[PDB]
Amino acid sequence: KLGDICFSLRYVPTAGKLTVVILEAKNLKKMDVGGLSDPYVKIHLMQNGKRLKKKKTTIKKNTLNPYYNESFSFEVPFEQIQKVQVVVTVLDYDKIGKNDAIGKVFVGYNSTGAELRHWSDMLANPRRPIAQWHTLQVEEEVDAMLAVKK
Template identity: 65%
Template sequence: LQVPQAEVPESTLVMQVYDFNRFAKHDIIGEVRLPLASLSLQHVIEQWSDLVVASKVEEEQLGEICFSLRYVPSTGKLMVLILEAKKLKRMDSHGLSDPFVKVHLILNRKKWKKKTTSVKKNTLSPYFNEAFVFEVPFSQIQNVDLVISIWDHDKVTKNEPIGKLFLGCRATGNQLRHWSDMLANPRRPLTQWHVLQPPEVVDKALGLKSHLKLPLTSR
């Protein structure tokens, strides 16, 4: 982690321990909070700390999504089965949403391929059961990121993102584990629930290269 020197006195390192659950949200066991101002950062620190009850202050809950991954190295086929979502954030004035899912493949930090599910009307717990197949040669599988996002469809205004996550060798935590399990078990579909993250957080982590559109000049 890189923390600017000016931000160290006001920053706190938070380490949380979870009980892993493949088919539901992970349960938090406890946490340790270390104000950086109280630490001597010039040296490596090794110490035991007692876990305490996690802070009740949580980020806004955007929802969870369940999907299955399957990769066949011999044919280069990556299969993504979008199953369902639950506890989605309310986006419409009537307290519901019209969710649909976008599945992007990113190659070398540039958007490469995209698939989209159908729209499910007036629900916070949509069931999709829609499968997509991407052609990804085995030589490229280490260089791709799989980005899954849920959007609220709006006929009048612009569609709004509800939440997002990405998997691949650059991912972390639950997403990296799911991706690694898929690569370690070729041809076997692996299903898992994931917690949605704020879109801007995922976009920053991906560090996507922008596609510049040059203005046309008239002669």
């Protein structure tokens, strides 16, 4: 009910370089009255509970199906790649009032299901960008799961 997001993951082991390309979102929830949504994507690199790095896409105006093709790279040393989370949040930009979250997902070793599958496919295919769709989840539910270590 919140929408779907597609992004690719690439890890370059010898470089300790993690690249997330936000490709496209679709079926996004409508978050404006007298408009659609104005989605941008924020990416947080976290280590369980702690914020490490953040990046964000441009804003696409008045659409529930944004296309980005924007690449985001993070330094994650080989020894640390199974300790981090890449958190992807889609938000509706508003000039007036809160920028409300449409939904979010995270990938990493402590993710589950299709999110863990994507992460494992990345690690299993070093230097190759692996693209996968993800269902967006309620922000507060994903936030709770960020604390669950494996």
